[PDB]
Amino acid sequence: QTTFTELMQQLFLKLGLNHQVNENDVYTFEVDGHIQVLIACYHQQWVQLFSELGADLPTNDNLFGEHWPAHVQGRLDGKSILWSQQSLVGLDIDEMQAWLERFIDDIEQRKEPQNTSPILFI
Amino acid sequence: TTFTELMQQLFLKLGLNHQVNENDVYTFEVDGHIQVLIACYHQQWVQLFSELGADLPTNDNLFGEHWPAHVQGRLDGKSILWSQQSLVGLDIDEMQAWLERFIDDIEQRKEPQNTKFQPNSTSPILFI
Ligand SMILES: [Cl-]
Ligand SMILES: [Cl-]
């Protein structure tokens, strides 16, 4: 059964990105657009992605369906934070990398909307 | 371990006899006041949904209060609650516990007291 540490070490070897691991074993890295993504695991069971979006953005309806797992836009210290979670069990390297990629793409879109489906389905 | 199998395990525990095919949404009747829909997306994601019946004060919607989180969405100008997790690893005991937490939360959010807006969420946040 793969631990969070093993997973994240394998992932960062794969990605070749500059990153930090704090002394609470939270992984952090930053990419262009001043986007810092944090990955943390609770109780060796739940993996979270998190990013402070740096502004108080328009309140998102926060439905499920647009992303799997969902990307939820919350509010902390008067500013928007985006987060997404899923269980560690069954989480694999290809899933982590794809999840990170779509989470970052979502962040970029939300932080800069003025770039160049109305219906959600089960 | 499929959604069907998990649901049949829930019916066995509830004493129900009902057919729920892989793509079906099941309406879990809690109260003449509460229904929880249970669905599974792409044979992978178990999804809970309930209408809260008011346009509630915006929820800060942070993770941490329940695992998996209960997220307050807005749909047709009213508040909904939802929660999800992956089917892999999920078993009947966790499925029941999850449902109990979700139902408890719904009942609390439908009380007159949380009609009133809450204090702003502020860091540090410690998740023990
Ligand atoms: Cl990446
Ligand atoms: Cl109410």
Curated annotation (Swiss-Prot), chain A:
This is Chaperone protein SycT. Binds to YopT. InterPro entries: Tir_chaperone. Functions as a specific chaperone for YopT. GO terms for biological process: protein secretion by the type III secretion system. Keywords: Chaperone, Plasmid.
